């Protein structure tokens, strides 16, 4: 109905488009049946040209896929609209080509540069990162999937101190920006960061109907008040803030979510999250006409610490577990081409926003940058996963449990209460603290004395607030990566 020739909403000046091998997609609206010519200029020279015609059927859209472009810039992109004796031209300037990353999640990734530690110096450190272009999607929800973005908080723009730290939970994600900054330090070519994030949302709002069907999520349509403070309805956030973007070619996705699922559909998270990334991969693949990799990188953050009221069953450790598909590490078979950052040891007790919103986002960006370099940018043989036990065995006569880790381990502190084992007597189990007894470069021996001989399972770091800041027991000496939490059965 709106027949005004225009680019898509997220196509503006200063943007970053996807680089070779993938081809950037340029689409917009116009008059049905009119002809559209999209020309890419390097300076004043027209490097390339594609031709298409605006759909005469329902969509009312015109779309071209450019040829692979080499990272760099600046470029210009022009679209010309012609029909009969009617002529129109659109031009966007200072376009760059490089790796585009989509950041989404809830309030912890909404947190801005102005809100984190060392805020001012990070805010004003942009001089070497002017080719790290940024955009923040405004909060909109919709009952049905949308073809275009309704509302944009921060259009494509070069980073400045003001737009980096532009308020409380507003413009630029500290995590997204810092991660893109590490990425630019490494890659040294243009990076684009599009952040569409809504605080206090459950993963159901971010998933389409397909994931809900695949995981048999209860079709309440609504979600317990306190658990989630944002849009309850299913898939609305996805419909209005992520679906329109799936026609943009992007390098990868950064994801920080799970806090709102601690007490809502907890036990289905190990289904929904892998299903979510898979559905996003497929939908972006078809939306960009195959330009986005069908298995594009999906880097995510494991939930951080949280000072929580005492509870018999805490959701946070369960969600930390389910975020790995109950496997303890990524990438794994259920999540190929994915990297993770463990953040439970980066707890902030005195944060003004809450224990759940720690201000140390630089360390998170560093660990995510390790994961990305290893999994995505061919920096193999770089330690990006924390020490995880390859072998667990039980010595019933010695009343011990011998655990051996794949990587060498280094002891930062002993915690009698961090290791817990389950005591199933009369076939009724009970979780009890198991103190560490012996330690070695690659193995440690736990003690069973409090549980007699009915041992069934062990678990490590299964508390919402497991340790104090950067003070967890087990660490890698070289990589400064913490031993991730886990549960194992005997």
Ligand X SMILES: *[C@@H]1O[C@H](CO)[C@@H](O[C@@H]2O[C@H](CO)[C@@H](O[C@@H]3O[C@H](CO[C@H]4O[C@H](CO)[C@@H](O)[C@H](O)[C@@H]4O)[C@@H](O)[C@H](O[C@H]4O[C@H](CO)[C@@H](O)[C@H](O)[C@@H]4O)[C@@H]3O)[C@H](O)[C@H]2NC(C)=O)[C@H](O)[C@H]1NC(C)=O
Ligand Y SMILES: *[C@@H]1O[C@H](CO[C@@H]2O[C@@H](C)[C@@H](O)[C@@H](O)[C@@H]2O)[C@@H](O[C@@H]2O[C@H](CO)[C@@H](O[C@@H]3O[C@H](CO)[C@@H](O)[C@H](O)[C@@H]3O)[C@H](O)[C@H]2NC(C)=O)[C@H](O)[C@H]1NC(C)=O
Ligand Z SMILES: *[C@@H]1O[C@H](CO)[C@@H](O[C@@H]2O[C@H](CO)[C@@H](O)[C@H](O)[C@H]2NC(C)=O)[C@H](O)[C@H]1NC(C)=O
**CA proximity to 302, closest of 92, 105, 43:** 105
Among 202, 203, 246, 319, binds ligand X (CB under 6 A): 246
User: What's the distance, Cα to Cα, between the start and end of the chain in Å?
Assistant: 63
Q: What region, left, alpha or beta, does residue 5 occupy, with left being phi > 0 and alpha being psi -120 to 50 degrees?
A: beta
Q: What number of chain residues touch ligand NAG (CB under 6 A)?
A: 2
Q: Least distance in Å: CB of 189 to ligand NAG? A: 33
Query: Which parts of 103-208 fold into alpha helices (H)?
Result: 107-110, 119-123, 161-164, 174-187, 203-206
CA R_g for the chain: 24
Q: b vs e for 192-208, b when ≥16 Cβ sit within 10 Å of the residue's Cβ? A: bbbbbbbbbbbbbbbbb
The binder of 402, among ligand Y, ligand X, ligand Z, none, by C-beta within 5 to 8 A per type, is: ligand Z
- Closer of 90 and 411 to ligand X (Cβ): 90
Q: Retrieve residue 24's tokens.
A: 């950037």
- Closer of 87 and 267 to ligand NAG (Cβ): 87
User: Does 410 help bind ligand Z (rule: CB under 6 A)?
Assistant: no
Give the integer Cα–Cα distance in Å for 423 and 404.
22
| Coil/strand/helix, residue 393 | strand
User: Does 437 help bind ligand Z (rule: CB under 6 A)?
Assistant: no
Among 1, 121, 380, 397, binds ligand X (CB under 6 A): 121
The binder of 122, among ligand Y, ligand X, ligand NAG, none, by C-beta within 5 to 8 A per type, is: ligand X
- Closer of 445 and 480 to ligand X (Cβ): 480
The binder of 87, among ligand X, ligand Z, ligand NAG, none, by C-beta within 5 to 8 A per type, is: ligand NAG
The binder of 59, among ligand NAG, ligand X, ligand Y, none, by C-beta within 5 to 8 A per type, is: ligand X
| Interface segment toward ligand X; rule CB under 6 A; list 58-66, 364-372, 445-453, 458-466 | 58-66
Find the residue with minimal CB distance to ligand X.
287
Q: Which residue matches tokens 């980096």?
A: 164
**Distant-in-sequence, close-in-space partners of 108: CB < 8 Å, separation ≥ 6:** 175, 256, 259, 301, 304, 356, 357, 358
- Closer of 113 and 444 to ligand X (Cβ): 113
**Are the beta carbons of 275 and 230 closer than 8 angstroms?**
no
Q: How far is CA 405 from each of CA 93, 165, 439, 457, rounded to the nearest angstrom?
A: 53, 41, 11, 17
User: Does 185 help bind ligand X (rule: CB under 6 A)?
Assistant: yes
- Closer of 163 and 292 to ligand Y (Cβ): 163
User: Does 145 help bind ligand X (rule: CB under 6 A)?
Assistant: yes
Q: Least distance in Å: CB of 353 to ligand Z? A: 44
Interface with ligand X by CB under 6 A: which residues? 27, 58-59, 61, 63, 118, 121-122, 125, 128, 145, 147, 185, 246-247, 267, 270-271, 283, 286-287, 322, 326
Q: Which residues lie near ligand Z (CB under 6 A)?
A: 402, 404, 442-443, 445
Contact footprint for ligand NAG (CB under 6 A): 82, 87
């Amino acid at each position: 109905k709106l027949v005004g020739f225009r680019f898509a909403s997220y196509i503006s000046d200063y943007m970053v488009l996807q680089k070779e091998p993938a081809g950037a997609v340029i689409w917009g609206f116009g008059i049905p049946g009119a002809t559209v010519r999209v020309i890419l200029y390097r300076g004043q020279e027209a490097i390339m040209e594609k031709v298409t015609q605006v759909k005469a059927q329902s969509s009312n859209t015109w779309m071209v896929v450019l040829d692979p472009v080499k990272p760099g810039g600046p470029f210009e992109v022009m679209a010309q609209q012609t029909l009969g004796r009617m002529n129109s031209t659109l031009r966007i300037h200072n376009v760059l080509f490089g790796d585009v990353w989509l950041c989404s999640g809830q309030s912890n990734l909404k947190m801005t540069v102005s809100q984190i530690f060392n805020a001012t110096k990070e805010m004003y450190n942009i001089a070497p990162y002017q080719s790290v272009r940024i955009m923040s999607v405004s909060l909109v929800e919709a009952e049905e999937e949308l073809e275009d973005l309704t509302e944009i908080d921060l259009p494509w723009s070069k980073p400045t101190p003001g737009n980096l730290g532009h308020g409380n939970f507003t413009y630029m994600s500290a995590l997204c920006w810092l991660y893109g900054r590490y990425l630019y330090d490494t890659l040294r070519y243009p990076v684009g960061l599009v952040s569409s994030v809504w605080g206090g949302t459950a993963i159901e709002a971010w998933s389409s109907e397909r994931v809900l069907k695949a995981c048999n999520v209860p079709d309440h349509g609504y979600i317990p008040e306190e658990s989630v403070t944002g849009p309850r309805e299913h898939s609305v956030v996805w419909n209005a803030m992520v679906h329109p973007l799936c026609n943009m070619t992007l390098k990868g996705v950064l994801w920080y979510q799970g806090e709102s699922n601690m007490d809502y559909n907890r036990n289905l998270y190990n289904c929904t999250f892998p299903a979510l990334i898979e559905d996003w991969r497929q939908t972006f693949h078809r939306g960009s006409q195959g330009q986005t990799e069908r298995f594009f990188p999906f880097g995510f953050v494991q939930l951080s610490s949280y000072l929580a009221p005492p509870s018999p069953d805490e959701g946070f450790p369960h969600i930390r577990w389910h975020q790995t598909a109950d496997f303890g590490y990524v990438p794994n078979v259920k999540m190929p081409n994915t990297f993770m950052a463990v953040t439970m040891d980066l707890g902030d007790r005195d944060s003004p926003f809450g224990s759940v919103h720690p201000r140390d986002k630089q360390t998170v960006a560093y660990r995510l940058h390790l994961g990305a370099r290893a999994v995505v940018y061919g920096e193999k043989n770089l330690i990006f996963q924390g020490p995880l036990p390859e072998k667990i065995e039980l010595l019933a006569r010695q009343e011990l449990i011998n655990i051996t880790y794949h990587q060498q381990i280094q002891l930062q502190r002993q915690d009698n209460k961090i290791f817990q084992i389950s005591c199933c007597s009369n076939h009724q189990c009970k979780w009890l603290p198991a103190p560490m007894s012996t330690f070695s470069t690659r193995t440690l021996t736990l003690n069973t004395k409090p549980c007699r001989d009915s041992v069934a399972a062990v678990r490590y770091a299964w508390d919402s607030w497991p340790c104090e800041y950067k003070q967890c027991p087990i660490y890698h000496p070289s990589s400064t990566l913490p031993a991730p939490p886990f549960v194992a059965f005997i």
